[PDB]
From Swiss-Prot:
Tissue-specific expression: Expressed in the intestinal epithelium.
Binding site for hyaluronan: R22, R59, Y60, Y86
Disulfide bond annotation, renumbered to this chain: C9-C111, C34-C100, C58-C78
Free-text description of this protein's post-translational modifications in UniProt: N-glycosylated.
Subcellular localization(s) per the UniProt record: Cell membrane; Cell projection, Microvillus; Secreted
Protein name: CD44 antigen
Carbohydrate-modified residues: N6, N38, N81, N92, N102
Domain Link: residue ranges: 13-102
Record's subunit section: Interacts with PKN2. Interacts with TIAM1 and TIAM2. Interacts with HA, as well as other glycosaminoglycans, collagen, laminin, and fibronectin via its N-terminal segment. Interacts with UNC119. Interacts with PDPN (via extracellular domain); this interaction is required for PDPN-mediated directional migration and regulation of lamellipodia extension/stabilization during cell spreading and migration. Interacts with RDX, EZR and MSN (via FERM domain). Interacts with EGFR. Interacts with CD74; this complex is essential for the MIF-induced signaling cascade that results in B cell survival.
Purpose of the protein: Cell-surface receptor that plays a role in cell-cell interactions, cell adhesion and migration, helping them to sense and respond to changes in the tissue microenvironment. Participates thereby in a wide variety of cellular functions including the activation, recirculation and homing of T-lymphocytes, hematopoiesis, inflammation and response to bacterial infection.
Domain notes: The lectin-like LINK domain is responsible for hyaluronan binding.
Length: 150
């Protein structure tokens, strides 16, 4: 009973979270997951400011109201070579990664590791935060409040 959560640097408080190395988060699970990090789904304005500070990924993830990919450098296999906050328009499917926004984070690039999941609740799952540099933090708990996500 284990969940891996791969996380990134924070840029103006915004970061990316991928669950179990696959697109596997529903919109309801995404909001609950950000709440476990004392965070919220970013607004489009919050995401645009993060992009301006150096944030980019090559993965679709929820923000408030849309599924997006922030892009700085054009790459043919990431958001069809677009730059800016690329918005997913047409998809059959509902599960993505998520972005999260922590208002208490530094204002610009914070590429220190994440060493806590401060607002997880009591539960039976071994949850492991995996940083890009491989460093890990694990704790037993739960974050999902909707049954259809478990
Ligand atoms: C700076 C830092 N490293 N690990 C932890 C925990 C913290 C405090 N802020 C984090 C920021 C991203 C969401 C979770 C909370």
């Amino acid at each position: 009973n284990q969940i891996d959560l791969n996380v990134t640097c924070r840029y103006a408080g915004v970061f990316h979270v991928e669950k179990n190395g696959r697109y596997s988060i529903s919109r309801t699970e995404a909001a609950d997951l950000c709440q476990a990090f004392n965070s919220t789904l970013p607004t489009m304005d919050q995401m645009k400011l993060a992009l301006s500070k150096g944030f980019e990924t090559c993965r679709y993830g929820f923000i408030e109201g849309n599924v997006v990919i922030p892009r700085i450098h054009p790459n043919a296999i990431c958001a069809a070579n677009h730059t800016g906050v690329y918005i997913l328009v047409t998809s059959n499917t509902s599960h993505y990664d998520t972005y999260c926004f922590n208002a208490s984070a530094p204002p610009e690039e914070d590429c220190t590791s994440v060493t806590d999941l401060p607002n997880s609740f009591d539960g039976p799952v071994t949850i492991t935060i995996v940083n890009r540099d491989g460093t890990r933090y694990s704790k037993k708990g739960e974050y999902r409040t909707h049954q259809e996500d478990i």
